[PDB]
Amino acid sequence: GSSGSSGNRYGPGVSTDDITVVTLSDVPSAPPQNVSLEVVNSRSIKVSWLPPPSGTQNGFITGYKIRHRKTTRRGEMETLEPNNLWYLFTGLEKGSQYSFQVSAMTVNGTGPPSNWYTAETPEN
Numbered sequence: 001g002s003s004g005s006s007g008n009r010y011g012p013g014v015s016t017d018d019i020t021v022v023t024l025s026d027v028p029s030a031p032p033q034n035v036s037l038e039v040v041n042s043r044s045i046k047v048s049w050l051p052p053p054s055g056t057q058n059g060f061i062t063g064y065k066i067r068h069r070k071t072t073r074r075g076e077m078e079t080l081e082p083n084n085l086w087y088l089f090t091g092l093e094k095g096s097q098y099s100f101q102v103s104a105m106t107v108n109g110t111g112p113p114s115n116w117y118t119a120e121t122p123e124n
């Protein structure tokens with residue numbers, strides 16, 4: 001700490017300021033509940049589920065997203081049913097494996113999915 005310094009010569013210095021995304025979202029911050037699987041028949045399966053708690057979801061749940069997967073080359077399929085909180089998939093095969101997933105949907109958009117629950121059909 002003393003008085004003794006010598007300024008330096010001129011120097012360059014870039015400058016810029018871009019705009020960042022500051023949009024607000026009303027999407028949920030938690031997966032659905034009561035997400036289980038139950039094989040009714042060899043080529044039939046009923047998937048049930050329920051909406052999130054009255055604390056995470058902001059918008060009044062409008063519907064739900066459903067995505068099933070098949071044990072074969074890429075070729076999934078998305079589907080949603082606002083009617084009820086259950087979807088029965090019929091037309092599957094035997095000794096196969098299928099997976100599903102439920103996602104809460106709000107007035108804003110689709111919420112985060114839950115664990116990938118898998119289910120196998122009864123050989124007989």
